[PDB]
Design a protein around this ligand. Structure first.
Ligand SMILES: NC(=O)c1ccc[n+]([C@@H]2O[C@H](COP(=O)([O-])OP(=O)(O)OC[C@H]3O[C@@H](n4cnc5c(N)ncnc54)[C@H](OP(=O)(O)O)[C@@H]3O)[C@@H](O)[C@H]2O)c1
Ligand SMILES: NC(=O)c1ccc[n+]([C@@H]2O[C@H](COP(=O)([O-])OP(=O)(O)OC[C@H]3O[C@@H](n4cnc5c(N)ncnc54)[C@H](OP(=O)(O)O)[C@@H]3O)[C@@H](O)[C@H]2O)c1
Lengths: 403, 403
């Protein structure tokens, strides 16, 4: 066989969207292409120190590397070998480096049905920003990632399918539509909306987040994004009644002191407020297309998109990756910045409920960057000698040793 | 007749989209609700000083007030009187203050087929900003405003229409869709795309602009946003061949000296770059939804939406207004900032080819701010005494008399 499963650890379990983690959970990891190996191994080192520094030996991640991408092709002549697939369906938790494509990421998300795209973006003390006052940027985007126009139901204007549609709309729905038109079908599912929503609220509860904001354009798209809003409130008030409190209730007399706030904002407003007063957002709940855009903008609030981490969560598993590519320019040069993959580590740790260790990582990074101990991607702007990938991780390690 | 048309003026003519303006053009204006009267009259006063200062007496705007809104309800018992519609269909150019929606804006747009939403947004020395470096922010968003999901072709998840759509797509096109789904139809028209593109390029030529960037999400919406991109390039490479050069051609060998650059960016990249380096944008050519969102963000860059002008333009007419509302709390208190509407007039002036008057207005505003001579909405932050509406306008007038 290709992989030797660590007979020392146990697989993570899920009763109903909730993670049940063993003290020695087996976690898979894929180095990635290009800078992948250098930054991933660095992260794994940092994660371990953080785990031992927070729990001593009472907890330990039993890492299991699997092959995917260029390394897999070179070893077994298959970019996504069957055995890799088997370990993924069996352990379902993976930290993976960047993969190039001319799609492993797609396949993984689909076989584990990771419908929720999670994007946390928090300001890091020390980093330059395009914003004058980003000190309070501490939000996390929950993007439904299987619905909306991403379904791909569209047709060219000169196609026969488009014609059948125009014809059908004119007769049955009495809707007027010209011939020179491209056509796409925007779909919004109640089940899909209730899924992400339940996940967004459960997350707020367990991590003491104080607000969930539903992003939508329900005034022009009443039955798609409008319905998204409705279904979101609906399931929130029916299944999390004792934990939440709408905004229309707060300014209605009801008490919110000790509960999670749930409000909604028009797409337009958010694209404006994220720039003017981003501190207003805590958890952002959005359908597929809006969350994609909000994430791009949110992500831009802080310098170097390469220091952000993210994930794809399903009801029984998750994939954690940095928000960047392979950067073949630096492959094997010990120059790339591992903060991105490390932050995916921070995120994974939080999902696992191992917050003490995730806070250690978050704290060491803050301290290292404010202390001018950074990689070239940052050093090149603060006039200092950049640290290498390996040296930087180690600096994070010794820092965690005394905080 | 209810309206006394100035016998000294002439209507503005139209040739293939080109505004043919007499020296004594008649221009309709609507005071609007709330601060409308105060700000609109001040705009007219500054616009007339700009025109005069730039062209002495050889040109003059023959202003014609028409009634719309609550003033219309009060004088002739009609929110959008018949006499007003007739003046609009005849003169086709109007400067309109903010109107409270209880409708008129949409009705004017439709009756004049003003399909293009135009939003210029550029930095003003002295104004606060969310960005640390807004200095080179100087762009104009050209939004197609009659296509896309705004057409309203959508249906509730439990309507009989929705089930017909699901059945149709299932039997005729073989598409799998669950029953608990809201359904919306995104339409992208070749002709609507082509005309907005003609307007943008034509504006670029006319005003010595050098770059047109197409905003789209064609990688996921290939036949709608993607077609918008293809179609835009098409009309550009075929009808303005010796006026523009594509980004592909340039970084391929083609010389760009003496030509307008035409390129395209994926929507998500623009939500990032508009924040990190907006200076990279000149003219943004986008379809309905994208343009809406980018505009929201764009105008958020200056941080005083209430100082932005905008317009709706067709092949034979234009509506110019401020991006703010009726601000009822300040109605008739001579406190409201008139820069928004004045800016709308600046834009009207440029569309008329009266760039000299327009430049005067822009320079005056820049100076008034630089010299801390502003209305309260700005005084608040620069720690100086505030000028009233009336006084801020007379100051701009005092300034244009020196530049
Ligand atoms: N989740 C994923 O797996 C994922 C996501 C996006 C893209 N990709 C892949 O990336 C490949 C091409 O890369 P790209 O050039 O398109 O995006 P990239 O690999 O992310 O390179 C983008 C730029 O950002 C900087 N950068 C990226 N990672 C960095 C790091 N770890 N440390 C410091 N700086 C970093 C580099 O700045 P410099 O100019 O200083 O070199 C580089 O020029 C594509 O084939 C695509 O498949 C994968
Ligand atoms: N083009 C249009 O006709 C148009 C556009 C937008 C909205 N509206 C209409 O406005 C109506 C209600 O008003 P809204 O409150 O919804 O509009 P708004 O855009 O929200 O105007 C009110 C608020 O925005 C600020 N503001 C707007 N213009 C200002 C100015 N010229 N100077 C100083 N501050 C200004 C003020 O903030 P501060 O209190 O801090 O000074 C004020 O409290 C709606 O029914 C809607 O239909 C019309």
């Amino acid at each position: 066989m290709l992989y030797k499963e660590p007979e020392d650890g146990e697989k993570i379990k899920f009763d109903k969207g909730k993670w049940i983690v063993p003290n020695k959970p087996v976690i898979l990891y894929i180095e990635g292409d290009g800078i992948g190996p250098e930054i991933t191994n660095a992260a794994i080192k940092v994660i371990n120190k953080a785990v031992e520094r927070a729990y001593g030996s009472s907890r330990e991640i039993k890492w299991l590397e699997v092959y995917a991408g260029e390394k897999a092709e070179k070893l077994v002549n298959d970019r996504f070998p069957k055995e890799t697939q088997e370990m993924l369906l069996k352990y379902r938790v993976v930290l993976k480096g960047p993969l190039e494509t001319p799609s492993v990421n797609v396949a993984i998300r689909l076989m584990l049905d990771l419908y929720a795209n999670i994007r946390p973006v928090k300001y890091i003390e020390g980093l330059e920003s395009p914003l004058k006052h980003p000190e309070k940027v501490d939000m996390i985007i929950f993007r439904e990632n299987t619905d909306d126009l991403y379904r791909g139901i569209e047709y060219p204007f000169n196609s026969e399918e488009a014609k059948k549609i125009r014809d059908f709309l004119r007769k049955e729905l009495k809707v007027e539509i010209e011939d020179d038109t491209g056509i796409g079908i925007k779909v919004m599912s109640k089940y899909k909306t209730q899924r992400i929503t339940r996940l967004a609220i459960q997350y707020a509860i367990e991590h003491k987040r104080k607000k969930v904001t539903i992003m939508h354009k329900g005034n022009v798209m009443k039955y798609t994004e409008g319905a998204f809003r409705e279904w979101a409130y609906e399931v929130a008030l029916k299944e999390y009644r004792d934990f939440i409190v709408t905004e229309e209730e707060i300014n209605q007399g009801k008490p919110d002191q000790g509960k999670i706030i749930l409000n909604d904002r028009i797409a337009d407003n958010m694209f404006q407020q994220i720039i003017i007063r981003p501190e207003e957002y805590d958890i952002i709940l959005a359908p597929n297309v809006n969350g994609d855009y909000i994430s791009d903008a949110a992500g831009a609030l802080i310098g170097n998109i390469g220091m952000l981490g993210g994930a794809n969560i399903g009801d029984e598993g998750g994939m954690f990756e940095a928000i960047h590519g392979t950067a073949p320019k630096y492959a094997g040069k010990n120059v790339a910045n591992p903060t991105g993959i490390i932050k995916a580590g921070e995120l994974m740790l939080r999902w696992m409920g191992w917050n003490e260790a995730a806070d250690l990582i978050e704290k060491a990074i803050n301290m290292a960057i404010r202390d001018k101990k950074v990689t070239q991607d940052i050093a090149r702007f603060m006039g200092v000698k950049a640290l290498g990938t390996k040296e930087y991780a180690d600096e994070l390690i010794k820092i965690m040793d005394t905080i």
